Structure formats: C-alpha cells, structure tokens
Amino acid sequence: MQIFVKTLTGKTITLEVEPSDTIENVKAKIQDKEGIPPDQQRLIFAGKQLEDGRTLSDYNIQKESTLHLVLRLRGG
Incomplete structure (x- = not known):
C-alpha cells in the first residue's frame, strides 16, 4: 500500500x-x-x-492517507 507524507516544510512525498x-x-x-x-x-x-x-495494522491506517511527520522540536 502507498501513502503520502507531509512535513513542516509543506513537502509531500509518497512512500511504499x-x-x-x-x-x-x-x-x-x-x-x-x-x-x-x-x-x-x-x-x-x-x-x-x-x-x-x-x-501499521495496529493503527487503522489504510491506503492513501496523510501521515504527520514532526521533527524533534515541537514548534517555534
């Protein structure tokens, strides 16, 4: 299954x-x-x-969903 990953820089990348x-x-x-x-x-x-x-099965994350990628720092 594939999905999209979004970062704080507004970068969107697909992963398999x-x-x-x-x-x-x-x-x-x-x-x-x-x-x-x-x-x-x-x-x-x-x-x-x-x-x-x-x-992943543990977390009902189906195909083609948006995942949140957060860095070490919580924010500004």
Whole structure:
C-alpha cells in the first residue's frame, strides 16, 4: 500500500509500505529518503503517536492517507 507524507516544510512525498510494517521499518524508509535520523522524527496519526515495535495494522491506517511527520522540536 502507498501513502503520502507531509512535513513542516509543506513537502509531500509518497512512500511504499506494507500494512504489517513496523514503525521502525517505516521510519527507516523515511530516513533513507530524507536522511533525517529516526530519533529526531516523530510520526503521528489520528492524534496518536506510533509506538516502536507495533505494526501499521495496529493503527487503522489504510491506503492513501496523510501521515504527520514532526521533527524533534515541537514548534517555534
């Protein structure tokens, strides 16, 4: 399944992942493309932060959805 990722810079990028992918493996995909360490990024959906070791299936995230990519800093 594919989806779109939106950052604070208003950048939109599409990623290919499996519904059984772990928040880790997925972060790895993000790091590989954005080169941003996973320890500096946080992923949130449905107002909830994804926990490490869990699969997407855990979080009813279906195909073609918008994921929120937040950096280490909460904001300005």
